[PDB]
Symmetry: C2
Amino acid sequence: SGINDGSGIVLGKDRDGGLVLVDIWKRGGDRTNSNWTILAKPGAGKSFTAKMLLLREYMQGSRVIIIDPEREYKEMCRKLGGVWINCTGGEGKINPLQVRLRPQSPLALHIQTLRTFFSLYLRDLTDTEKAALEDALVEVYKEAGITWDTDPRGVPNDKWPTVKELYEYCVKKAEENPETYGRLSVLLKRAAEGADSYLWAGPTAVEADSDFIVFDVHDLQNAEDQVKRAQYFNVLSFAWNILERDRRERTVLVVDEAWMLVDPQTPQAIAFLRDTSKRIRKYNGSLIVISQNVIDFLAPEVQRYGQALLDNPTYKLLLAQGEKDLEAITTLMNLSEAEHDLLVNAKRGEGLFVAGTQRIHIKIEAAPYEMQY
Amino acid sequence: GKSFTAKMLLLREYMQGIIIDINCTGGENPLQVFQSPLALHIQTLRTFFSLYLRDLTDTEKAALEDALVEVYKEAGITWDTDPRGVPKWPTVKELYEYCVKKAEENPETYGRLSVLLKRAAEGADSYLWAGPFDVHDLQQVKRAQYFNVLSFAWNILERDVLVVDEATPQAIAFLRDTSKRIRGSLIVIS
């Protein structure tokens, strides 16, 4: 049907070969936010399209922040002179316990964030254990000299406690409290000293202050699920903090392979993403969710958050879909049989573009000069 | 005539043989209390204090919990200790004192909290608790006292019939638990 805003960026071509041009910062009528949902099976063209969209928004002055488990955004980041953070290497160490603003006591809020972090990493923790874990975090902070009034802004990266201190506190308290701190301590040990210590046991090494930032969490794709999720959450909470502290307009936050964040037993992580999708409007930024495995967002435990997360954004790009994903999407977004079929037989980079209540056939393609990236 | 009906109800019930109205209003403690016993009670107290103090921020709601845990710690009881060993337990006074102690470095978090506990620690309300069932003497403070007694009266039976006359929403939730975890009967009039 054609979509052409005043100005904006070129997305691609419509069915009649005419230019689709979108201003994602528009407000008015059915343009209520600047968020995107990009969904498709692997190989469909998600990362290509997102690269185009991101490059063109960057060139118009948007800061870009990406969480990238695929290592799809490294080369772009290099071409643009942005900061590439390797989160599995020592230089990309992000300390979960370093207090940061979530989407009032900074410490109390951060402890609310840490409950989700540790529920993701340590699944199936008794309620006593959760209470005691929070007590332990409070005491470890207190020993590091940080209390309920302390402003995070002032504290140097190395003054924060780490999971090492938390582990040792729990072990010490497990002497006179073996029953409520025992298995807890043994579970923290893997992160403090064991095979996951390289992730979090040490001070934050990154000062990511740049208009193009990529958080590469690729070296985790063979890691266990709870590690994947806990680190994805930790990085997402850090990146959100970046957008909130130094708060220029039109910052685009990209969560690639967002399904990795979904956990039926800790739906709060996805709820955190949802909250991000709402609060980001307050800084005139954009949350872009990119993903396969759409059904993971629609499972009973998380659907309250997953549905809004996928469906509330003003802009959507649906490429070729997996069979289940296609049915769940067809239902969720009330696709017509024409639209459904469109998806069924869509070539790479082709599909449905949604802008508010407008939905049209689109084909995305790159200028030659955009190939370098 | 609900009081009459319930009166003869209780009278006939009496013919075969503990009720929120010993003038439990002062003289002759809401800090008296695998699964550590302390945590559960700390939950109880979330609702109790949410009843006494409205306007309570979430930061304050967490700082009060921390303070609680610490004051207990000073009393010498922690996570693994058996609450049948306590004759000795801390009281609202130690809590207030702690809060005042921490308010000098945490005025934003404990500042408007300590002054909130003054009246209950050694002021207008301290006769009720600051030391180690009828409440019509007190007719936010009444809802609070009523809830405290509800807890001390549910306990008796847990460690063993309850009339709940003229019966922070967690407060009404507590009810459903006691009224299901009966395994005496639970009478409610309103």
